[PDB]
Amino acid sequence: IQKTPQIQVYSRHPPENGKPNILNCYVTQFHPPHIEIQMLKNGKKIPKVEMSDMSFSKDWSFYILAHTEFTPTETDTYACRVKHASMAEPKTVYWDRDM
């Protein structure tokens, strides 16, 4: 089997320019479990990021949480690039404070 992941790049607490925070990239509903997740603070990799331990739901699809402290604003654009078999090219996703 082969299933495509789903990504969400949201933050913990309400976006406040200049204040620190935490940025989440919640990758879910995928298979095989072999996956690669990255965070970009403009297009460059980020402090290797913390990889929450993986798990799966009744449906069998896998889940995981990549998180890394960050201080937003209008500074730069944050995103999450997910490499994974299922997909053709590295699907990336940009944060959207207002999302």
Residues that bind other proteins (CB under 8 A): 1-3, 6, 8, 10, 12, 22, 24, 26, 28-29, 31-34, 53-61, 65, 67, 98
Cα(16)–Cα(72) distance, integer angstroms: 7
Task: Considering the complex, state which of residue 12 and residue 19 has its C-beta at the smaller distance from other proteins.
Answer: 12
Task: Considering the complex, state which of residue 59 and residue 89 has its C-beta at the smaller distance from other proteins.
Answer: 59
Which pair of tokens denotes residue 14? 């309400």
In angstroms, give the least distance from the CB of 82 to other proteins. 16
Task: Considering the complex, state which of residue 44 and residue 58 has its C-beta at the smaller distance from other proteins.
Answer: 58
- Contact present, 64 and 54 (Cβ < 8 Å): yes
Buried b (16+ CB within 10 A) or exposed e, 29-41: bbbeeebebbbbb
